[PDB]
Amino acid sequence: SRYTDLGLQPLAGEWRHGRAGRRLKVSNPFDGSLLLEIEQADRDDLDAAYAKAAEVQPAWAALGPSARAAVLYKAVEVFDRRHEEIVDWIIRESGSTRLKAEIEWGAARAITLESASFPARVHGRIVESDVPGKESRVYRSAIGVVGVISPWNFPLHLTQRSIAPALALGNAVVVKPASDTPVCGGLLLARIFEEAGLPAGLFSVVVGPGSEIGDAFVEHPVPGLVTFTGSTPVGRNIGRIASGGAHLKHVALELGGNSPFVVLGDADLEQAVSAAVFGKFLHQGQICMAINRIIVEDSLYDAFAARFVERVKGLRVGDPQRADTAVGPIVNARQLEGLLEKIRLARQEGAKPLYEGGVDGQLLAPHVFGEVTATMEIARDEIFGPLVGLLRARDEAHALELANASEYGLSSAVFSRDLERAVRFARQLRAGMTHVNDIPVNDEANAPFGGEKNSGLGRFNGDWAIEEFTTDHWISVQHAPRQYPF
Amino acid sequence: SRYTDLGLQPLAGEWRHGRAGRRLKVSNPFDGSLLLEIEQADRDDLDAAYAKAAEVQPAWAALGPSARAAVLYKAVEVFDRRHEEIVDWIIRESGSTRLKAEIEWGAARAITLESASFPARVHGRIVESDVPGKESRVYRSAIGVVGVISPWNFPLHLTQRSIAPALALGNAVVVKPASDTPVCGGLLLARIFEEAGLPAGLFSVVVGPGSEIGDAFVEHPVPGLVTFTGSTPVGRNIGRIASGGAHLKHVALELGGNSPFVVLGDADLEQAVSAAVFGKFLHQGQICMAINRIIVEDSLYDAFAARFVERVKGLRVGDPQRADTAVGPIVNARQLEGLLEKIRLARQEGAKPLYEGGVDGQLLAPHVFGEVTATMEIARDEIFGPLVGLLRARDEAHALELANASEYGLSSAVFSRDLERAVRFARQLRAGMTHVNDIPVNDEANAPFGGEKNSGLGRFNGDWAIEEFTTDHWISVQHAPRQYP
Numbered sequence: 001s002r003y004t005d006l007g008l009q010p011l012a013g014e015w016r017h018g019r020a021g022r023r024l025k026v027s028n029p030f031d032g033s034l035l036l037e038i039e040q041a042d043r044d045d046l047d048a049a050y051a052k053a054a055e056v057q058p059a060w061a062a063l064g065p066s067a068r069a070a071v072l073y074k075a076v077e078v079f080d081r082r083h084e085e086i087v088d089w090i091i092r093e094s095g096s097t098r099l100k101a102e103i104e105w106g107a108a109r110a111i112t113l114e115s116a117s118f119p120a121r122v123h124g125r126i127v128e129s130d131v132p133g134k135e136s137r138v139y140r141s142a143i144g145v146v147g148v149i150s151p152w153n154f155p156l157h158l159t160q161r162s163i164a165p166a167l168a169l170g171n172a173v174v175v176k177p178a179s180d181t182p183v184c185g186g187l188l189l190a191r192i193f194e195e196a197g198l199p200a201g202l203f204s205v206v207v208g209p210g211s212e213i214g215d216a217f218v219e220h221p222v223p224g225l226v227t228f229t230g231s232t233p234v235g236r237n238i239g240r241i242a243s244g245g246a247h248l249k250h251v252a253l254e255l256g257g258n259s260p261f262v263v264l265g266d267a268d269l270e271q272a273v274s275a276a277v278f279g280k281f282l283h284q285g286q287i288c289m290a291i292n293r294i295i296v297e298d299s300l301y302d303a304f305a306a307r308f309v310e311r312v313k314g315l316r317v318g319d320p321q322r323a324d325t326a327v328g329p330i331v332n333a334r335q336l337e338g339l340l341e342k343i344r345l346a347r348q349e350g351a352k353p354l355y356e357g358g359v360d361g362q363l364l365a366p367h368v369f370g371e372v373t374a375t376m377e378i379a380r381d382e383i384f385g386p387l388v389g390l391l392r393a394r395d396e397a398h399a400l401e402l403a404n405a406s407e408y409g410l411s412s413a414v415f416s417r418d419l420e421r422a423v424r425f426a427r428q429l430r431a432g433m434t435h436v437n438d439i440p441v442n443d444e445a446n447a448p449f450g451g452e453k454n455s456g457l458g459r460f461n462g463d464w465a466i467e468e469f470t471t472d473h474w475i476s477v478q479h480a481p482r483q484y485p486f
Numbered sequence: 487s488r489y490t491d492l493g494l495q496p497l498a499g500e501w502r503h504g505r506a507g508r509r510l511k512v513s514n515p516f517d518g519s520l521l522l523e524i525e526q527a528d529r530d531d532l533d534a535a536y537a538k539a540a541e542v543q544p545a546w547a548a549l550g551p552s553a554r555a556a557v558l559y560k561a562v563e564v565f566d567r568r569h570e571e572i573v574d575w576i577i578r579e580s581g582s583t584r585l586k587a588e589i590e591w592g593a594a595r596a597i598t599l600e601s602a603s604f605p606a607r608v609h610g611r612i613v614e615s616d617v618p619g620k621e622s623r624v625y626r627s628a629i630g631v632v633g634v635i636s637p638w639n640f641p642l643h644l645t646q647r648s649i650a651p652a653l654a655l656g657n658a659v660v661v662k663p664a665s666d667t668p669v670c671g672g673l674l675l676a677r678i679f680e681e682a683g684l685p686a687g688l689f690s691v692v693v694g695p696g697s698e699i700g701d702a703f704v705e706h707p708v709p710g711l712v713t714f715t716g717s718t719p720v721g722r723n724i725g726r727i728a729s730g731g732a733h734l735k736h737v738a739l740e741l742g743g744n745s746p747f748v749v750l751g752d753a754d755l756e757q758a759v760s761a762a763v764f765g766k767f768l769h770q771g772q773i774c775m776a777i778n779r780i781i782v783e784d785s786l787y788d789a790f791a792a793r794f795v796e797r798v799k800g801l802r803v804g805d806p807q808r809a810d811t812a813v814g815p816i817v818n819a820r821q822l823e824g825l826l827e828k829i830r831l832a833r834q835e836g837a838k839p840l841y842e843g844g845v846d847g848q849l850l851a852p853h854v855f856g857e858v859t860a861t862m863e864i865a866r867d868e869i870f871g872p873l874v875g876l877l878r879a880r881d882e883a884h885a886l887e888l889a890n891a892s893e894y895g896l897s898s899a900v901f902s903r904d905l906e907r908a909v910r911f912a913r914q915l916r917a918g919m920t921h922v923n924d925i926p927v928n929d930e931a932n933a934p935f936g937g938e939k940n941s942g943l944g945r946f947n948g949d950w951a952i953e954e955f956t957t958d959h960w961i962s963v964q965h966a967p968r969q970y971p
């Protein structure tokens with residue numbers, strides 16, 4: 001029995017329509033078929049969602065660790081039971097290929113399972129003090145209410161990466177998902193957590209335009225933390241509100257980044273090309289960790305830029321429901337326009353085209369470019385699409401200066417048969433994550449996930465998640481009269 | 487022999503005059519006498535300090551932990567050798583009581599000593615991976631260049647609390663001190679670290695008007711991290727630039743907090759009143775931790791008030807250089823004017839005046855108001871002064887609502903003889919730190935230090951300092967080829 005009545009949004013403990021009087025139509029990117037229609041959430045709905053989350057969170061925190069962990073374990077069972085249902089929703093709503101939808105399902109399933117162990121793992125500290133009679137204590141407790149903003153690209157995994165740890169550690173959450181993917185934005189995650197036995201009021205979804213309710217979501221005096229994943233222009237506005245607005249709160253910001261792919265002269269050129277193809281065209285380039293630009297040492301550029309285009313030509317563009325589809329449709333119209341503008345600017349700027357696939361409706365084929373410079377737009381800005389530019393490098397020093405020439409280092413990759421040469425290069429990269437002899441699209445559950453420069457505030461996953469979604473309360477207890485100088 | 491030529495600032499590896507063309511006069515708040523004159527730094531000076539710091543930092547980080555720790559240990563020796571000179575500087579520049587200046591010297595010494603252990607403690611992680619043939623490495627490294635903005639109230643301690651951990655962990659630091667206290671704002675510390683053997687260009691001090699160069703200081707692309715301790719309006723502007731600016735960097739914020747001091751009915755009255763007097767009137771009230779609200783259960787309220795007022799009358803407002811003096815001059819006239827307005831506003835609000843002390847030049851005697859309510863400005867806003875309001879609570883539950891009814895919660899105190907009830911109450915407090923049967927003003931090098939709500943972003947000291955001033959880099963190495971679908 002598949003979930004029905006998806007349009008109703010969990011709001012302050014009950015499933016009801018929003019009161020904005022405005023409707024959001026959720027459509028399939030591939031064919032345009034309407035999937036459902038949602039009565040959008042109000043500013044009063046948001047205040048109610050937060051207030052109820054505050055009211056029922058202490059009861060959730062007061063539950064013992066096994067009780068909260070049981071909900072997370074039960075959530076894993078549902079993930080298995082509704083596996084095709086979950087994957088099919090990812091495909092139809094976000095326009096993900098079937099094979100990406102399976103990868104996203106497994107990533108979200110893994111962080112849920114990983115989060116289940118967190119109630120047993122978190123602990124406080126007992127500290128020795130010089131003051132006679134003074135005992136110093138630190139309690140580790142849940143923040144309270146976590147507001148979570150979710151992007152369209154990987155809407156399920158990226159929402160679940162915040163709320164699954166946050167809920168396990170005794171927080172309550174309010175999710176504001178992307179308007180293009182409100183269902184895989186935690187509307188379904190809310191349904192899954194309800195099935196898992198999550199008490200009502202701890203998980204609320206507010207569906208509305210981030211340009212209209214977003215400021216109120218981050219400004220709100222209730223949430224102690226706001227996590228975000230998306231664009232740098234919006235992440236900047238979110239940070240400026242949360243760190244400069246009326247009510248201050250922490251922020252975890254994962255801005256998009258500009259993953260460089262560095263192929264040094266002594267690289268295994270087959271491995272490099274295969275990694276470059278998969279690490280670019282998984283999800284049609286719509287990944288924050290997708291490689292943005294490929295930088296090959298000159299003594300190997302032509303070999304790479306030739307085997308690269310060979311294999312790019314062999315990627316099947318088409319219907320995402322098929323397991324053999326590599327490239328599916330682009331998520332919406334404006335995003336497709338922005339990538340066609342980028343292709344036109346790459347010609348305007350002199351980049352030699354090596355392959356122009358077509359554009360068939362919402363299906364945009366790969367568009368490879370070579371002889372690219374660091375100042376070209378296709379190299380400097382983040383492309384959430386099947387666009388790639390190839391950059392020629394002389395010395396490895398030039399590979400390193402080219403790779404660091406981006407303002408946001410999130411992830412990166414460097415290829416060389418000499419592992420020590422590759423690690424020293426990777427230590428020189430101003431990015432939070434580098435993968436040697438592998439793709440930059442990686443996210444293991446015990447591994448720190450976050451950015452540096454203009455793409456990152458904070459770290460997720462594992463012990464980094466336990467620290468992110470809790471707070472430390474220093475409590476000193478004086479067991480004897482302290483003598484004061486006046 | 488004592489430090490001379492203290493107006494020269496360390497910019498880009500050289501001690502030189504600022505290029506701004508405006509001269510800054512540093513004057514004793516108590517008498518108005520001039521300590522020294524500084525040629526202020528312009529934006530070109532700021533660019534040079536950041537650029538040199540980024541240039542010399544990798545060689546500093548490349549050095550072993552013992553070498554960097556050795557500089558921290560030698561700096562502790564300078565702290566002991568120049569102890570009286572440091573305390574004298576704090577008294578004259580900042581208007582501090584000698585007793586507070588000794589406290590600040592001790593706290594700054596401890597942070598410097600504690601940081602010396604940090605280079606040995608930093609470590610990376612090796613993590614198991616499901617992907618076959620893949621080894622996952624997490625490298626902990628220095629951030630790079632750290633920008634530090636220091637307030638005037640505890641300039642030497644609050645600068646060193648960021649400076650000493652960052653330097654020990656391999657970072658380079660650029661410090662913008664409060665214009666009222668540039669010498670104890672890091673000019674003194676830069677001399678101390680130079681004497682300790684810190685290489686040139688690793689530590690720069692930029693002295694300029696906050697309205698003139700402050701935005702450029704936070705805006706700059708070089709610093710990986712910016713730390714601020716000070717007022718909430720300025721912290722909001724710093725947070726708005728760093729989180730929202732063209733170049734994005736982490737910010738650690740310490741913003742002034744209305745700190746609740748709660749006296750429950752069973753509390754030992756002598757201890758509470760003594761803690762309230764010392765907690766409030768240490769350094770004339772100009773502490774982030776200092777009490778802003780005293781909340782007492784109604785049963786004990788009237789008894790607490792009389793003891794507090796009677797004790798406050800005892801405190802001597804006087805020349806800060808004397809050991810016996812408890813209340814000293816307000817740091818500057820602009821600070822004094824606002825406190826006088828807050829006093830007058832509190833009468834307009836309808837608070838009963840329990841004690842009204844004189845104002846004589848910069849010295850402002852204690853002012854105590856009673857029957858305060860939460861909506862009043864004296865309770866609502868933090869006051870960096872010898873001003874306190876007393877609030878009446880019907881029961882323990884009402885006291886909890888009063889204590890938590892604050893936009894910002896840095897520190898708190900709860901007094902009750904029953905420790906379980908006090909700790910239970912303490913957990914409910916919306917603060918980073920709570921002290922049970924003790925003053926709210928407490929800083930411990932091992933203990934975490936920071937604020938909640940509109941009072942703080944980030945934590946300081948101990949393992950928190952190690953996390954704050956280092957960045958983790960996840961590097962995964964493929965030893966066997968991995969298949970791609």
Ligand SMILES: NC(=O)c1ccc[n+]([C@@H]2O[C@H](COP(=O)([O-])OP(=O)(O)OC[C@H]3O[C@@H](n4cnc5c(N)ncnc54)[C@H](OP(=O)(O)O)[C@@H]3O)[C@@H](O)[C@H]2O)c1
Binds near residue numbers: 149180230231254
């Ligand atoms: N993971 C990543 O790094 C990542 C992810 C997605 C996109 N991007 C980049 O961003 C671009 C796409 O931009 P976009 O138009 O889709 O927006 P976006 O920044 O991708 O939006 C992400 C989320 O933020 C919301 N949002 C938008 N304005 C907001 C505001 N003022 N306050 C709060 N939330 C707000 C959106 O909700 P509404 O839809 O209701 O506004 C959405 O749920 C692409 O160029 C791509 O490269 C990066």
Ligand SMILES: NC(=O)c1ccc[n+]([C@@H]2O[C@H](COP(=O)([O-])OP(=O)(O)OC[C@H]3O[C@@H](n4cnc5c(N)ncnc54)[C@H](OP(=O)(O)O)[C@@H]3O)[C@@H](O)[C@H]2O)c1
Binds near residue numbers: 637638639666700704
């Ligand atoms: N300052 C505090 O620690 C504090 C704490 C609690 C309450 N208050 C309240 O706030 C008032 C006093 O505040 P204040 O203005 O004297 O202290 P402040 O300016 O907040 O001092 C903090 C530091 O920030 C600098 N600064 C100012 N504008 C800046 C900017 N745009 N960017 C970067 N740095 C900037 C200041 O340098 P300059 O000195 O060169 O301007 C100073 O070194 C009083 O009403 C008091 O009750 C203050």
